[PDB]
Amino acid sequence: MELIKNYFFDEGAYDYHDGAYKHLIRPKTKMHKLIIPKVLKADKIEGNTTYYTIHAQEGETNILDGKATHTWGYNGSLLGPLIRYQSGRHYHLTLVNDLPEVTTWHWHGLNIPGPIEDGGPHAPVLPGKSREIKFDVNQPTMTAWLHPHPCPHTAEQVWKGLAAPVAVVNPLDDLPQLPHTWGVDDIPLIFQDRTFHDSQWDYQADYDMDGTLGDTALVNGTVNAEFTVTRPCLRLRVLNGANRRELRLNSDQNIVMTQIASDGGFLPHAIEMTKIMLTNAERAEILLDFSDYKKGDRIVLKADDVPILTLKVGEFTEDNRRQLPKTLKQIERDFTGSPSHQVIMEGMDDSVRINGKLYDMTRIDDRQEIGKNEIWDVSNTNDSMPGMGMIHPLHMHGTEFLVLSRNGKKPYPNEFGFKDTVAVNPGEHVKLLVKFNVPGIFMYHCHILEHEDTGMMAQIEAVDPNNPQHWNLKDLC
Amino acid sequence: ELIKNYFFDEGAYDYHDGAYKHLIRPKTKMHKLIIPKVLKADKIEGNTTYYTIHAQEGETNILDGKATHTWGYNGSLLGPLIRYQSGRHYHLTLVNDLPEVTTWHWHGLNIPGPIEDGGPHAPVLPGKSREIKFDVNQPTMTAWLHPHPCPHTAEQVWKGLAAPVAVVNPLDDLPQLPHTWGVDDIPLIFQDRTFHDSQWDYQADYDMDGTLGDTALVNGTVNAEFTVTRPCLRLRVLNGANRRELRLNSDQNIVMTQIASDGGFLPHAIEMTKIMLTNAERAEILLDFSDYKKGDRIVLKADDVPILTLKVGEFTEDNRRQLPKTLKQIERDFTGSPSHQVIMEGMDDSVRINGKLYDMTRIDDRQEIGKNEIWDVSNTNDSMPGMGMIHPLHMHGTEFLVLSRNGKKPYPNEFGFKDTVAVNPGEHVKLLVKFNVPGIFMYHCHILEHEDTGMMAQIEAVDPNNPQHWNLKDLC
Ligand SMILES: [Cu+2]
Ligand SMILES: [Cu+2]
Ligand SMILES: [Cu+2]
Ligand SMILES: [Cu+2]
Ligand SMILES: [Cu+2]
Ligand SMILES: [Cu+2]
Ligand SMILES: [Cu+2]
Ligand SMILES: [Cu+2]
C-alpha cells in the first residue's frame, strides 16, 4: 500500500552510466563474521567534561583469507570505534597523529565551532605531533561519523582506511523504544568499495578524477560479511563511506525496511520501503523485523546486484519489539520566501566547480548570521539526458538543514527530517532551510571525494553579530 | 500534592509488640552493595528456554570477621536475577543440593498449581531434583523466588534462600525506564537477621508471632553503599523479612517516584518521601540525582537505621526520559456482592483463617477461571493501639485489584495489580480476583511464622471444561 518499492533519485544520472564504471564483484572468500566497531572508552570524566583520545595509526588487517592488508585506522589497524557523544555535555579530545603524513579529524555531522574543532582543511595535525580541542554538544539524536579532511589529500586517506561511526544522543528527543544494545540488536553498516592489488590497497592505481571506484564491497571492513540475528527487531545504521559509489541497497526477499532516521536525525514519521538509495556521506537508520521468519533463513542485502551483508536468523533470546509513536519527532517545516543564498554546482571531472570558482582556502565565499533561518537554492547544471548526467551530494559543515522542495515539488518520502548531505539530480533546484547555531568558518562541498580534492569546496562565515571576528586564513593545500 | 506519610494505620505497626526488637546499625566497614548476577540460560530451543537452579549450601563473608553459613540459589546466599518473558515457554530444573526438602515457590508468577506453583505440594528431596514446564502470560512486574515447604518456609528463608525475578511483557513494558541492571537499575532485598558469632541461628531468635533480627541486610550486604553513575535510579524494593515491616525513609526526604507495585505498573506515578512495605510487597521507585553534587550521600533508612547509602559519583550519561501521564491502562469499574470471604484472625498461636488451620488435604474454596469475583479479606484483631498487628494477605497464581478499604478508596499506590495486601485491624479490604490458570493455589498470611503455624488455605481455580479429581496428600 504505502510501501515504497523504488529508488528515489533520478536514474538517468546513476553512477553506472559512466564510461569508466566498475561493476562490483562478489569475491571468492569464506563468509567472514561481521566486525562490530568497539565502543571508544573515556580516559576520564571530570565535571560535565568527558576526555577522549584518538590515535590515527597504521596497521595490518586480515580482510581476505590470505595475506593481510596495509590499513590506516583510528585506535586500530582499520576504520575506527564507536564514538558516543551526548547533547548538553562538554568534551575534551586529544588527536594523536601516528601516521606518516598530516591529517585532520572532521566530525561530519557534529555542529561544533569552525574551522578548528570542525576538523576541516584548516586544522592539521603533524606526523608525531598531536592536538587538543574542547567543545560542547547541543544537537538532536542522530548518527554521524568521523573522517579525515586534509586538503587535497582526503580521498586518499579515506581510501587508506580512515573512518569511524559516531552516535549522538539527546535525552530530550531520544526514542528508547528502539534497539540500543550495540553489537546485538543495534549495528552499523559502513559500506565502502576497494580493489585489492595482491591483498593490498593502492589508491594511485584506481584513481579517477570523476571519483574512484572499487570492485569489492566492504562492510565495517568485512568481506562476505555475515551477522547472526538473535532478536526480532534489528536497527541498522547505514552509511555510504564510498569515495564515489552510490549505494542502492536491496534484498532478494524484499524485506520491509522501516526508516526512522536520516543524516540529521529522526524523521517526523517512519517510512516503509524495500529499497533505498544513498549517495556519499549519507546515513539512514532502518529497522528490520524477523518475526515471520524461521531459524536458519538468510536475508541477503545487496548493493544493486552484489551481496554485501547476510543476516542469518538464529534462536531469539528476547522480544525487543516496542510500539513506536506515530510522530517520531516534531519538526516545524512552515517556511517561505525568496532564497538568500545560491549554490550552482557545475561540471564533471576536471570542470567541477561551485559558482564558477574552485576551492581557495584564504577566501570567504559567503556569510550568514547565526540564529536566523535563511533559504538556499542548491542547483546542478549537468546535462539531464540519460547518462549525460551525474548526481552530486551537497554537504554543509557545522549545520543540519531541512529540504524544503525539489524543483518546486515536495522532497522524497524520507527527506522531511534534518539532513547535512543531499543528492542533487541534474537540472534540479533543491531548496534548503539552513540555520547556523555556532559561528566560525565552515565548508560546503560535493562529498564525492575526488571532486572536493579537485576544488568543489567553498567557505561560509557563520557570523555572530555580537562578536565580529578577524580571521588569519592561510592556505595549506 | 506530595505524600509525606506512611500509609498504613500506625496503631498496629510492628513496634507496638511486647517483644519487638529495634534494629541496630552494626559497627563494620562500609561494604559495597552486592548485585545479584543474571541467571544464564542452559539452552534455547523453539519458544522454550531452559533454566537450572540449585538450592545449595555455602559460606559468605557478610561481616568483616568469620564467614556465615548460608543457603542460596546457584550460590552461597540469596540467588540471581531470573528473567522471564510474557509469551514464552520455560523448562526449569530444580536441583536440591541442600540436606533437607525444599520447594521453589515463584511468588508473583501466574503458573499452574500446585506443582509448578512451587507450593507445599511440590517437595524436592535432598539429592534428587525436579523438572517443570510452563508458559508465562502476565504484565511487566518484579516477582521473587522463595522456598515454601510445610512447616519450614520461615527457617529456610532465614537460612538465606530467596531471589529476585524480573518479568517483562513487550506489549506493556516502558523502555523509558532505567533497565541497565547493576548500573541504573538495582534490587533492594531488605531482610533482618541476628548474628551469633557471625552465624545465623533461627532456633535462637524464634517468635511464633514472627521472628525479628537486629541487623538489617540489603542483598545480603551489611552497611551497603552503592555508587550512582547516572541521574535516574530504579530501585526494586522487596521486603524479604519474616515479620519486620519496612518503613523506608531518607534523612534528606528525596522524592521517590513509585512506578510499580507487586503486579506491575501503576496507572500513574506517585511521588512520596516515605513508603511502608509489609512482607512480600514490592515497589519499584525512581530517584533523581540531578540537583546533587558529586560526593553527596543519600542515606536510605528503615525507620531510624540506615540500610543503603547512595553515594553520588561522576555521571556517565543522562538516562532521564519523559514518561507518559498514564503508565498503564486498567479497568477498575467493578461492583456487586463479595462471592468470597477471608476472615483473618488471631495473633501468635491463635492465628487462623475462617476459624481453621492449614490442612493440606482440604480444598477450602473454589472459583471458576476467567470470571471476575470479589473477595472480602478482613482482620479481626483489636483496633485499639498496641493490641493489633497488620497481616499481609498473599494469593498464589493470581494478581488482584484492591477495590476499597473499609469502603474508602485504597491508598495512593494501590490502583494497580497486587498479589500481597496489608490488612489493618478492623479493616475490610475488597479485592477483585481472577484466575487465568487452573489448579490448587494457596492464600495466606505472609508473616512466615503465621504460615508455618497454619494461617493458610487452598482454593481450586476450576476450569469448567476440565473438571479434575485430586489425590491430595499431606507432605507436611
Ligand atoms: Cu564528510
Ligand atoms: Cu562535514
Ligand atoms: Cu561532484
Ligand atoms: Cu567536509
Ligand atoms: Cu511468597
Ligand atoms: Cu505466592
Ligand atoms: Cu498473620
Ligand atoms: Cu505462598
Numbering used by the authors:
A (entry chain A): 1 to 477
B (entry chain B): 2 to 477
What's written in the study?
We obtained two types of crystals for LcOe 229, one for the enzyme without Histag and the other for the enzyme with Histag, that were grown under two different conditions and which diffracted X-rays to 3 and 3.5 Å, respectively, each one having a different monoclinic space group. Crystallization of LcOe 229 was achieved by mixing 0.3 µL of a solution containing 13 mg/mL of protein and 50 µM of CuCl2 with 0.2 µL of the same screening solutions. Crystals were grown in a condition containing 18% PEG 10000, 20% glycerol, 100 mM Tris-HCl pH 8.5, and 100 mM NaCl. Crystals were harvested and frozen directly as this condition also serves as cryoprotectant, then, they diffracted X-rays to 3 Å. For LcOe 229, the Ramachandran plot showed 93.7% residues in favoured regions, 6.21% in allowed regions, and 0.21% of outliers. The asymmetric unit of each crystal contained two molecules, which exploited two packing interfaces; however, according to the PISA server, both interfaces were the result of crystal packing. A comparison of the two molecules in the asymmetric unit of each crystal indicated that they were identical, even between both crystal types (RMSD between molecules was 0.2 Å for 476 residues), demonstrating absence of conformational changes between them. Interestingly, in both crystals of LcOe 229, we just could trace the C-terminal end until residue C477, which was forming a disulphide bond with residue C151 of Domain 1. There was no electron density for the last eleven residues, an indication of disorder and flexibility. The structure of LcOe 229 showed the T1Cu site with a Cu2+ ion coordinated by two His (H451 and H392), one Cys (C446), and one Met (M456).
